[PDB]
């Protein structure tokens, strides 16, 4: 007898048409073991159980809630536009993958006394498809390497700090530009040491000394230097270097 | 609750599985006789010791057993058309499909015609014979499928040969139905002069 | 790992991995199956494993003797090559049932192309 159950709320029972025969695949199993083995493998979309009968054999079945129905090929193909998907008309760069599923078949002998009572994955590699973190968009294996998406300093942060500078009223624009260039120089490189602090000095003057002439904000910039020499991050010869670079 | 909704939940899985059975019963994914739990199938062991040069003379044994020949030079005498206008006949040649071509090509020839009266039932006249040479050739049938004949007053078809290398027709009398664009029909008999 | 048990050792409850099939294709397959049963009657008459062939005669053939023959023909038009039968075995061949395993090679695609599709469908490349 075949039992179909929906949370026991609604249920239907039918009677087998001949024994040891598959209702769906129509296979004459000729063994209840070959039958039950056929049931799980062939009808994987469902679940199956043995509940015994007054005659001796009764089967109750239900849907596989965790059924593994999904596309198995290259994941990048699913999200392509229709027509472009399932092309298979040219070589496709795809990430390497490897799976191991059979190390040795157990080949245990059939035994119903144990089987009815019981009834009563070596993967390797980047399997799943990854997405662009910045924009929530699918990646492609082609650019799967260079995609740091991360660096010393994001652009929007540069915008926000510049805007916050203008809020200050006590600062003349001659000074305001000074730290804009100097700060934007900082998180561009992220110096953290006093030695780097000095090295940043000839570095910053080297890159933007001409721009200092262009803005003609030199005198404010020397004073901005003197503060660090007051903060011990600058030596006198360092100040001399800026003069030489400027001129 | 209602079993109709319960059936509706399970309808698609069963419908999918019914189609899956049909294709596998035609194009299986695996050999069921190789199943361990289906061990009664293919119970015979593999006797790899069996030699294969024996297949050489065994092939000759069946070949002289299966020697074939054909009559020679088709002939057929006309008989009155029956219906409640002359009639024409055509012969076609069917060829196997090759790698490049998408559908198997077919070639047709206008074998002949006859001036059949307007539905002559009985006592129409006082016969005429259609002469066919050895157009069919076993060597040609090696490269193309068997030929066939067409009849038009109105379409009808009748094939001469089969892939079993055995002729389908014989020198008896024939009366084929005649379909347009019981009912219209033409009669005749086959000869081998 | 020597103590590696079966593949079931994964999880208790996780989000569904999304089903690859679709609805509109499901209905088309069903109706294709439905119209398939309207002529082949696999589900209704063949019990899901057989097809019914009803015999019809195209031509009547009489030899010199009393072995008058008929050329039996079946409606699906994808059936086996057409054969000559006599008058005596008319009227019970009017319902022929053939198992799926006994169908000819070409009939596999004649009944339904979707039974097997040559996916390239053309010579894009070797």
């Amino acid at each position: 007898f075949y039992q179909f159950l929906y949370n026991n709320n609604t249920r239907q029972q039918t009677e087998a048409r001949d024994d040891l025969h598959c209702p769906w695949c129509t296979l004459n199993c000729r063994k209840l073991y070959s039958l039950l083995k056929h049931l799980k493998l062939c009808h994987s979309r469902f679940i199956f159980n043995y509940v015994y009968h007054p005659k001796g054999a009764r089967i109750d079945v239900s849907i596989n809630e965790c059924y593994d129905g999904s596309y198995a090929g290259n994941p990048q193909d699913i999200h392509r536009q229709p027509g472009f998907a399932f092309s298979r008309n040219g070589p496709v760069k795809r990430t390497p993958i490897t799976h191991i599923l059979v190390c040795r078949p157990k080949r245990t002998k059939a035994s119903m006394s144990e089987f009815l009572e019981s009834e009563d994955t070596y993967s390797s590699g980047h399997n799943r498809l990854y997405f662009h973190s910045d924009t929530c968009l699918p990646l492609r294996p082609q650019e799967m390497e260079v995609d740091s998406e991360d660096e010393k300093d994001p652009e929007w942060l540069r915008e926000k700090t510049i805007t916050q500078i203008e809020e200050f009223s006590d600062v003349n624009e001659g000074e305001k530009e000074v730290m804009k260039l100097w700060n934007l120089h900082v998180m561009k490189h992220g110096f953290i040491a006093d030695n780097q602090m000095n090295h940043a000095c000839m570095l910053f003057v080297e890159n933007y000394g001409q721009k200092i002439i262009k803005k003609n904000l030199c005198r404010n910039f020397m004073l901005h230097l003197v503060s660090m020499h007051d903060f011990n991050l600058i030596s006198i010869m360092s100040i001399d270097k800026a003069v030489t670079k400027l001129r | 609750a209602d079993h109709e909704l319960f059936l509706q939940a399970f309808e698609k899985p069963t419908q999918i599985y019914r189609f899956l059975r049909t294709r596998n019963l035609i194009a299986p994914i695996f050999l069921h006789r190789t199943l361990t739990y289906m061990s009664h199938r293919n119970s015979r062991t593999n006797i790899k010791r069996k030699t294969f040069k024996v297949d050489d003379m065994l092939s000759k044994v069946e070949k002289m057993k299966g020697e074939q020949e054909s009559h020679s030079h088709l002939q057929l005498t006309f008989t009155g058309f029956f219906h409640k206008v002359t009639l024409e006949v055509l012969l076609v040649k069917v060829c196997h499909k090759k790698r490049k071509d998408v559908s198997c090509p077919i070639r047709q020839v206008p074998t002949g015609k006859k001036q059949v009266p307007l539905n002559p039932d009985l006592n129409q006249t006082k016969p005429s014979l259609a002469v066919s040479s050895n157009e069919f050739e076993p060597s040609n049938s090696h490269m193309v499928k068997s030929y066939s004949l067409l009849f038009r007053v109105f379409v009808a078809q009748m094939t001469v040969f089969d892939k079993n290398r055995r002729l389908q027709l014989l020198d008896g009398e024939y009366e084929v139905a005649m379909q347009e664009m019981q009912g219209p029909t033409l009669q005749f008999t086959l000869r081998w002069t | 790992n020597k103590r590696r048990k079966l593949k079931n050792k994964r999880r208790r409850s996780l989000p569904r991995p999304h089903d690859f099939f679709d609805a509109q294709t499901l209905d088309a397959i069903r109706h294709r199956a439905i119209c398939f049963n309207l002529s082949a009657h696999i589900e209704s008459l063949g019990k899901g494993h057989s097809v019914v062939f009803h015999s019809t005669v195209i031509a009547k053939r009489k030899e010199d003797s009393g072995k008058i023959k008929l050329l039996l023909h079946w409606m699906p038009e994808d059936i086996l090559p057409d054969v000559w039968v006599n008058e005596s075995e008319r009227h019970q061949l009017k319902t022929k049932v053939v198992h799926l395993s006994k169908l000819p090679k070409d009939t596999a695609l004649l009944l339904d192309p979707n039974i097997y599709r040559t996916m390239p469908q053309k010579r894009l490349k070797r």
């Binding site: 239907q12 039918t14 009677e15 048409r17 209702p23 | 309808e11 069963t14 | 439905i34 589900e43």
Partner: peptide, 29 residues
């Protein structure tokens, strides 16, 4: 549904329209 007729419930469930066959599938409605 009270009559657990046969396995025919499959033949009852699928052809709900378009000339339901066997004329007896209505019993296991």
């Amino acid at each position: 549904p009270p009559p657990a007729t046969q396995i025919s419930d499959l033949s009852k469930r699928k052809p709900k329209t378009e000339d339901f066959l066997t004329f007896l599938c209505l019993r296991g409605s």
